[PDB]
Amino acid sequence: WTATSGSCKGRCFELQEVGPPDCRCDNLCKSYSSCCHDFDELCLKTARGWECTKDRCGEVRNEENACHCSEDCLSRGDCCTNYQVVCKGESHWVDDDCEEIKVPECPAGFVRPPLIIFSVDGFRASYMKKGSKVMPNIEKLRSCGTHAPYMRPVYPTKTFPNLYTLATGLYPESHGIVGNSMYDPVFDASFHLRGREKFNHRWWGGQPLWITATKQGVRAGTFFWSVSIPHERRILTILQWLSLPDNERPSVYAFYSEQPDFSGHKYGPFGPEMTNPLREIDKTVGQLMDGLKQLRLHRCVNVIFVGDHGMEDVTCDRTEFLSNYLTNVDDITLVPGTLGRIRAKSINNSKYDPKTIIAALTCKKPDQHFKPYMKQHLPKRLHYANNRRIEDIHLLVDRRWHVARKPLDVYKKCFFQGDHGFDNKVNSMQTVFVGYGPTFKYRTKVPPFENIELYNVMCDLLGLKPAPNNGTHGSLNHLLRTNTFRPTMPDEVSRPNYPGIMYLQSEFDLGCTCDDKVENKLEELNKRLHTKGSTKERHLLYGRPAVLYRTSYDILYHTDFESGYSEIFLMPLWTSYTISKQAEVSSIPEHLTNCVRPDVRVSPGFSQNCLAYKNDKQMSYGFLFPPYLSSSPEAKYDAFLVTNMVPMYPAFKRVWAYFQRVLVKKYASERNGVNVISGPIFDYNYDGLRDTEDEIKQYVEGSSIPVPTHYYSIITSCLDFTQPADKCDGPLSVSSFILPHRPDNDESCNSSEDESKWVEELMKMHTARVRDIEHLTGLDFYRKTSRSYSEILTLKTYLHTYES
Ligand SMILES: *[C@@H]1O[C@H](CO)[C@@H](O[C@@H]2O[C@H](CO)[C@@H](O[C@H]3O[C@H](CO[C@H]4O[C@H](CO)[C@@H](O)[C@H](O[C@H]5O[C@H](CO)[C@@H](O)[C@H](O)[C@@H]5O[C@H]5O[C@H](CO)[C@@H](O)[C@H](O)[C@@H]5O)[C@@H]4O)[C@@H](O)[C@H](O[C@H]4O[C@H](CO)[C@@H](O)[C@H](O)[C@@H]4O[C@H]4O[C@H](CO)[C@@H](O)[C@H](O)[C@@H]4O)[C@@H]3O)[C@H](O)[C@H]2NC(C)=O)[C@H](O)[C@H]1NC(C)=O
Ligand SMILES: CS(=O)(=O)N1Cc2cnc(N[C@H]3Cc4cc(Cl)cc(C#N)c4C3)nc2C1
Ligand SMILES: [Ca+2]
Ligand SMILES: [Ca+2]
Ligand SMILES: [K+]
Ligand code: NA
Ligand SMILES: [Zn+2]
């Protein structure tokens, strides 16, 4: 209940919201049906529209008018945004030459440059080029400020998940807004775009920027606007707030536009009806910038122009129906559209079986337009699993398609031509970033980056300490003229052991065999040098990775590779090796097919054993340094050490052997050498973070050898490919992957074919950032380079996306 009989007199767009039953006058009161009875009359004036005309110049103030053109309007802070152009002979901001903003040029009383976020819904990255002729204000921000060719959203590429990620720096799995529709089984409560449940604070985790500001003594404008408040009124409200007294005035603001998303759903991303929404957004940017110029704030404020996600062509005919796959379609609940989420319709139904649902949805139709996953098996780059609001069964829907439960869902609820929500690496889902102002760089292009990184920068722009988040603070320092964040590398927690030869062959009872009895002080000296690390500078190009947790591990040197060997997990944490462009691929010799060799540097008690693999009928083994890329027949024996072995399902060995035998050489050929760091990952609780030993759910039968959930590789070369990877003077280039260690190839519908037709497609889907592997391993890479630490942080956030 609300006492609407109160009044908004002197309260219009008040910044602190009052508590029920008191009536409200803030920018969200309409959304709560709680505005005072006189809110429209006092706070949403429309009379005479939004623009000064020559006849209004120097008018007697009429308080009924939407905006003013009276001599007192700049003093009151309520001029129409074109007042000085129409009435005082000024230019529009967009008609002024770009002039570098080297320092903030702020009115007396401004303690810091304000930040204004201009957020646009559904603004696809390619609109910046394709719509340039109709967006002059936006094109001036873009060309004169700092811009990226695109900004990568989070998955799912829906509105609330992405806006709340912009606000928090968190993945959706961490902030809790995992879709635009959600069921929380602990709350037994449903979140929808329509209705009141979504206003309950229990949905919204993390700490959004307006809370971070307020807690640190920086005042914020409210970021949410009720839909019926016209954009012109939103702009005039921001400009009026910027005219408040110093002690009352916010330092951070947000504008929001529902366009171009609203029209893009109706007309498609490039429908001819899309030009007018782009022109209208541009005009709104112009009102803001002319308004700031009037207030002498246009060389004071930092402006961010940012979108939440893009927009794809999607029509009602491109819908897959689960009723064409499942016997049991009435026993499931589907969250449908550009992603699927499946759970039981009733938790009382004991016949419900996720395994039979997955199997019925797997590679059943030749051009099937979705792929089912258990959420832990989703590509790790999506970071879409560690939340009870994310159903165990997920459908990744192909771009341009929908999934629905039954056909009647699509026509008993069409005409739409656009949608979004797909995999956040899809080109059509990419969105925009421009930063303009004193704290941003001038006429600067930056590479694409992820929207999780922006919260830290907005905190930098406001002098705030960010709440703990999933950005990598410093990775976006190259956007900024000033207020850079200069972190120190994390401290190494565990120092390695450097074991020498300590064990005789006969002390090992591992059940291993190798045909390696083949008896020269020239080479015997060389053998010793290689075991002491004489080739380590070729194979360890960027320093030893640092271990950022407490453990026991050994550095093991070899002719062709170096490893950090865990005495706790009985296998390497990392294996590092360099493959030149000139490297030769060889076979595993016939006599060595089943060769495994004890490592006389490592105790039998801290070694794997071959008998466990013989007894475990499901599990086989592979090697981290590939025997195919040995430098010589003699060096190849090192590759068969028990300390280089890792557990691998036979199905996974098809993937891994193709990577090692074909793809590493291909990348060395293409990139002018590569350095490879490979290793295991254990994430049985799918939280994106290194498991401790007591979290491991599977061992090699009858042993303490833990089974990885994933295998990674980090593949580094010189960005200037005219220099070989091992003699690179400048910036680096990286690609990485986190491959799921699965006992079948059910994810790859063409896996019956030769690996040349499916394995690289699998690896592209599971592309990763170095930072993703850092979280999953507790390792810190690139500790010893010639490069600035912020440049290395940017490299660690890079994702190789494999889009055209
Ligand atoms: C992205 O960046 C984020 C932010 O840095 C980071 O997430 C942080 O990860 C930490 C490890 O998973 C975790 O640390 C402690 O969490 C709780 C305290 O949690 C509450 O308080 C904080 C601080 O204000 C809140 O932010 C937090 O919000 C979460 O829960 C809300 C209510 O559910 C929810 O609204 C909100 O969205 C958020 O949920 C998310 O995180 C939770 C986990 O907290 C997930 O479950 C959700 O699915 C969702 O993902 C809370 O209100 C501490 O209690 C923990 O300590 C445990 O566990 C330790 C084990 O290592 C142990 O040593 C401790 O003794 C203690 O154990 C006890 O409890 C166990 C579990 O119940 C029990 O089994 C055991 O026997 C014993 O009794 C953690 O130290 C942070 O909460 C988390 N923050 C946020 C914001 O998510 C992400 O990891 C990265 N991502 C990547 C990939 O890098
Ligand atoms: C889903 S929707 O259509 O129902 N909807 C209505 C509505 C109203 N105002 C806004 N304002 C945005 C402006 C902004 C900027 C940044 Cl950086 C982070 C966040 C967050 N968080 C927001 C909220 N957004 C929406 C999204
Ligand atoms: Ca949106
Ligand atoms: Ca984990
Ligand atoms: K076996
Ligand atoms: Na298959
Ligand atoms: Zn939309």
Side-chain angles (χ1 to χ4, degrees), residues 1-412 414-518 520-804:
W1 188 83
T2 294
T4 71
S5 69
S7 174
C8 287
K9 184 182 172 148
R11 297 172 52 205
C12 285
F13 289 102
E14 64 187 348
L15 285 158
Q16 294 113 86
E17 127 197 24
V18 301
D22 302 333
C23 66
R24 285 173 53 176
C25 306
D26 62 285
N27 57 358
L28 263 198
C29 67
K30 292 278 203 192
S31 296
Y32 286 83
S33 278
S34 65
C35 304
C36 303
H37 72 281
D38 56 4
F39 177 81
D40 288 291
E41 183 190 359
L42 296 183
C43 307
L44 298 178
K45 293 173 174 163
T46 50
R48 305 202 65 186
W50 309 112
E51 292 170 10
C52 288
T53 56
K54 207 71 233 296
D55 51 304
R56 292 191 56 185
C57 299
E59 66 187 4
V60 184
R61 159 170 294 258
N62 183 341
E63 302 285 19
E64 288 184 349
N65 289 330
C67 53
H68 300 282
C69 315
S70 48
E71 196 57 39
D72 68 0
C73 73
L74 279 180
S75 176
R76 291 274 308 265
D78 61 9
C79 308
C80 307
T81 65
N82 69 340
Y83 167 70
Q84 285 198 150
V85 170
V86 170
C87 298
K88 297 272 186 258
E90 264 291 352
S91 46
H92 287 288
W93 171 84
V94 68
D95 292 316
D96 299 334
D97 292 354
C98 298
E99 298 295 355
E100 187 167 10
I101 313 165
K102 292 198 186 166
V103 299
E105 304 175 9
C106 294
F110 279 78
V111 67
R112 66 182 70 77
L115 173 62
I116 301 176
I117 304 150
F118 193 110
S119 66
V120 284
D121 206 313
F123 201 106
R124 177 174 174 164
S126 59
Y127 290 156
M128 282 308 196
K129 173 171 141 291
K130 299 174 69 68
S132 63
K133 298 303 121 261
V134 305
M135 301 187 303
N137 285 274
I138 292 164
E139 289 306 334
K140 181 182 170 179
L141 287 177
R142 171 176 176 295
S143 54
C144 304
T146 295
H147 82 281
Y150 55 88
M151 181 181 70
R152 185 180 306 115
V154 286
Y155 187 74
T157 58
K158 300 291 199 177
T159 297
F160 271 138
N162 277 277
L163 289 175
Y164 204 61
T165 286
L166 289 171
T168 61
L170 295 168
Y171 298 118
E173 67 179 1
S174 289
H175 65 54
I177 312 300
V178 306
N180 278 334
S181 133
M182 309 184 271
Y183 175 68
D184 186 308
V186 167
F187 298 168
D188 182 37
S190 283
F191 181 107
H192 315 281
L193 285 157
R194 291 170 92 71
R196 286 288 140 80
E197 189 44 46
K198 73 170 185 291
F199 296 111
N200 189 324
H201 284 187
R202 70 186 168 177
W203 294 98
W204 305 86
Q207 192 182 88
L209 182 64
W210 52 91
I211 298 299
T212 304
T214 300
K215 289 190 181 271
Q216 296 179 48
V218 176
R219 278 173 294 282
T222 48
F223 278 31
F224 300 90
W225 301 83
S226 296
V227 66
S228 65
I229 304 165
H231 293 188
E232 297 89 343
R233 177 54 63 203
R234 306 179 194 187
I235 298 306
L236 285 164
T237 298
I238 292 164
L239 293 173
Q240 187 73 68
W241 286 333
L242 277 163
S243 289
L244 285 166
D246 299 333
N247 77 280
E248 296 177 53
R249 183 174 58 242
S251 289
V252 58
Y253 302 89
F255 170 86
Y256 176 70
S257 169
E258 304 81 6
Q259 290 281 38
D261 177 88
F262 181 69
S263 286
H265 282 283
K266 291 180 189 318
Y267 305 120
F270 308 112
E273 303 85 347
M274 293 311 296
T275 292
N276 281 343
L278 298 179
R279 291 193 186 277
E280 281 313 291
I281 297 157
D282 199 69
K283 178 172 180 159
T284 301
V285 174
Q287 289 175 354
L288 176 64
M289 298 310 295
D290 289 350
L292 293 175
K293 186 183 179 187
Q294 300 209 127
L295 299 183
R296 303 189 152 101
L297 286 169
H298 66 303
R299 298 173 55 78
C300 175
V301 171
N302 296 297
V303 179
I304 290 171
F305 183 88
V306 66
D308 58 352
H309 55 66
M311 185 70 67
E312 176 64 273
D313 292 290
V314 187
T315 61
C316 322
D317 60 315
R318 289 196 298 267
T319 304
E320 286 268 11
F321 299 100
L322 298 187
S323 57
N324 294 327
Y325 293 82
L326 300 181
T327 73
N328 55 284
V329 191
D330 291 316
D331 292 340
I332 67 166
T333 292
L334 174 72
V335 180
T338 55
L339 52 152
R341 314 203 301 275
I342 293 174
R343 61 182 190 281
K345 192 182 163 57
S346 177
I347 61 145
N348 297 319
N349 174 14
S350 56
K351 280 319 195 289
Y352 181 84
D353 193 347
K355 294 192 88 226
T356 73
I357 289 159
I358 293 285
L361 291 179
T362 295
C363 307
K364 281 309 186 258
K365 268 78 144 100
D367 279 2
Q368 195 168 299
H369 301 280
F370 66 89
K371 186 175 302 297
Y373 289 86
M374 296 299 296
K375 61 182 184 167
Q376 60 276 17
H377 291 154
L378 289 169
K380 297 295 271 178
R381 62 184 170 78
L382 300 176
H383 295 280
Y384 196 74
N386 187 29
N387 198 291
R388 64 197 192 209
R389 302 162 185 170
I390 300 170
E391 286 78 2
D392 289 353
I393 303 173
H394 200 78
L395 310 184
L396 282 186
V397 178
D398 289 358
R399 72 188 77 186
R400 287 161 65 84
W401 284 74
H402 280 178
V403 67
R405 197 168 64 93
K406 302 191 229 149
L408 65 84
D409 290 343
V410 163
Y411 63 83
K412 296 298 102 183
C414 203
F415 298 102
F416 67 75
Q417 296 184 273
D419 205 358
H420 54 86
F422 305 106
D423 184 339
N424 65 332
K425 79 168 166 69
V426 166
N427 269 348
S428 57
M429 294 301 94
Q430 306 312 291
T431 190
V432 298
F433 175 81
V434 175
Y436 177 95
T439 315
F440 285 111
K441 292 183 174 195
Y442 174 67
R443 296 189 175 277
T444 293
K445 197 176 53 189
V446 300
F449 65 87
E450 299 191 335
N451 67 352
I452 60 170
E453 300 300 330
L454 197 55
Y455 170 79
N456 282 334
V457 166
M458 293 191 290
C459 287
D460 290 337
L461 290 167
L462 294 165
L464 298 176
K465 182 178 178 165
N469 72 89
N470 303 128
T472 293
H473 201 179
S475 77
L476 295 186
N477 279 347
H478 60 285
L479 278 62
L480 301 174
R481 177 184 300 273
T482 74
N483 298 32
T484 61
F485 177 83
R486 292 297 179 186
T488 65
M489 282 186 180
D491 292 334
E492 183 148 34
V493 171
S494 296
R495 284 186 308 91
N497 303 302
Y498 298 88
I501 298 180
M502 299 157 65
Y503 299 92
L504 298 172
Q505 176 87 12
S506 65
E507 295 188 70
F508 294 90
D509 186 11
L510 302 185
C512 300
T513 67
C514 187
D515 185 38
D516 63 346
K517 290 210 205 101
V518 183
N520 295 300
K521 72 164 54 168
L522 184 265
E523 300 155 300
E524 209 61 75
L525 184 67
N526 265 1
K527 213 263 182 295
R528 269 171 253 169
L529 289 193
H530 293 157
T531 301
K532 298 330 158 185
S534 74
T535 66
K536 74 194 159 175
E537 300 314 336
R538 188 108 176 292
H539 297 302
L540 196 73
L541 291 182
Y542 324 104
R544 79 166 172 278
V547 174
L548 303 188
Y549 60 98
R550 182 68 264 164
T551 200
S552 185
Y553 81 102
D554 304 310
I555 305 297
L556 304 180
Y557 297 118
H558 322 75
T559 305
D560 294 339
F561 64 105
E562 182 178 336
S563 65
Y565 178 82
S566 176
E567 290 196 335
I568 302 312
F569 282 71
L570 306 177
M571 66 184 72
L573 301 178
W574 57 260
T575 299
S576 183
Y577 63 96
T578 299
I579 302 300
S580 79
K581 181 175 187 178
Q582 291 74 224
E584 190 184 27
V585 180
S586 58
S587 75
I588 292 176
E590 293 180 32
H591 74 289
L592 296 178
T593 303
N594 300 309
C595 169
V596 180
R597 300 175 60 247
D599 191 332
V600 292
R601 300 169 292 192
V602 172
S603 71
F606 293 132
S607 300
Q608 291 181 45
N609 70 93
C610 295
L611 179 52
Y613 292 105
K614 174 180 196 305
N615 289 345
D616 191 318
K617 296 313 205 226
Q618 307 315 311
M619 187 63 57
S620 185
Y621 66 87
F623 293 109
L624 286 175
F625 173 79
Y628 315 105
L629 292 172
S630 62
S631 61
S632 73
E634 185 191 338
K636 196 189 294 285
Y637 286 89
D638 300 343
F640 302 105
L641 285 168
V642 70
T643 49
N644 184 45
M645 191 168 57
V646 288
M648 293 189 170
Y649 289 117
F652 188 78
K653 289 174 58 191
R654 297 184 61 200
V655 176
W656 193 250
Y658 187 77
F659 166 63
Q660 289 193 319
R661 181 178 65 78
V662 180
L663 300 175
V664 172
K665 166 67 179 160
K666 185 171 98 177
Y667 302 151
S669 295
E670 289 173 348
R671 300 179 56 176
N672 197 359
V674 289
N675 176 257
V676 179
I677 306 174
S678 300
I681 280 161
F682 306 85
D683 192 21
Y684 276 96
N685 63 351
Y686 48 88
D687 64 356
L689 307 173
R690 179 192 52 92
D691 288 357
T692 56
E693 315 164 62
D694 65 0
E695 293 179 324
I696 305 304
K697 298 178 65 170
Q698 182 74 239
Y699 289 88
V700 185
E701 183 174 341
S703 82
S704 292
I705 307 164
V707 177
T709 56
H710 301 77
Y711 282 99
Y712 71 86
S713 293
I714 301 167
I715 307 180
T716 313
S717 67
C718 198
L719 184 63
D720 179 1
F721 55 74
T722 76
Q723 311 194 313
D726 63 346
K727 294 193 234 78
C728 184
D729 293 328
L732 305 174
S733 172
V734 70
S735 61
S736 308
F737 61 77
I738 302 163
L739 277 167
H741 180 213
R742 288 173 67 178
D744 60 69
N745 290 299
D746 285 4
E747 184 179 357
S748 296
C749 294
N750 300 313
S751 66
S752 72
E753 298 166 30
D754 188 67
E755 289 89 1
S756 64
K757 305 300 188 197
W758 64 269
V759 161
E760 203 171 12
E761 170 182 338
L762 178 67
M763 291 172 56
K764 292 175 188 185
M765 200 53 182
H766 293 275
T767 191
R769 313 173 302 143
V770 172
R771 197 75 180 105
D772 296 326
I773 293 164
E774 290 189 339
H775 296 316
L776 283 163
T777 66
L779 303 171
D780 191 65
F781 300 96
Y782 301 125
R783 306 267 303 173
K784 303 294 198 178
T785 79
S786 57
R787 317 301 305 172
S788 102
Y789 185 40
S790 293
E791 180 184 309
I792 291 302
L793 295 177
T794 306
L795 185 70
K796 288 182 175 189
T797 66
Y798 177 77
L799 185 71
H800 195 104
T801 51
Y802 301 102
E803 289 282 297
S804 64

